[PDB]
Amino acid sequence: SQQTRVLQEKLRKLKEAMLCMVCCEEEINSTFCPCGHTVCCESCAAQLQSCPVCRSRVEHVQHVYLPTH
Amino acid sequence: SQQTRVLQEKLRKLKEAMLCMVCCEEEINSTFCPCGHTVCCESCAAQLQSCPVCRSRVEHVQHVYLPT
């Protein structure tokens, strides 16, 4: 039905929000510290000196184990 | 249709996976450091000396700003 199409769209958008903002291909699994923005995969987070969202200095990257992984 | 029910169940499970594993009421927004398990809201994470997934000591809690 049309309701099935609406639910498919909600699921697709939620899943796309879980992907890295830089490569758009891998799941997010890294946090920039101390700001806390958790928007990248490990590879993309590895070479950034400043947060791509807020511009804060990245002191280190924390790996995150999320249930949605 | 039956697919509407199947999709509603998939959405419900994905939403429940984003909720705190302890209180089941608030969204996950905190990481236990250094282990990295990100399974609690800030109120439950503040009250745990040990990670509820791996039992490692919690040195500190990092707030996470997630896209959703």
Ligand SMILES: c1cc(-c2ccc3c(c2)OCO3)n[nH]1
């Ligand atoms: C990559 C990103 C996520 C994610 C994103 C938002 C969330 C969340 C998990 O649980 C609470 O709200 N999972 N894998």
Ligand SMILES: [Zn+2]
């Ligand atoms: Zn990436």
Ligand SMILES: [Zn+2]
């Ligand atoms: Zn940031």
Ligand SMILES: [Zn+2]
């Ligand atoms: Zn909680």
Ligand SMILES: [Zn+2]
């Ligand atoms: Zn842990």
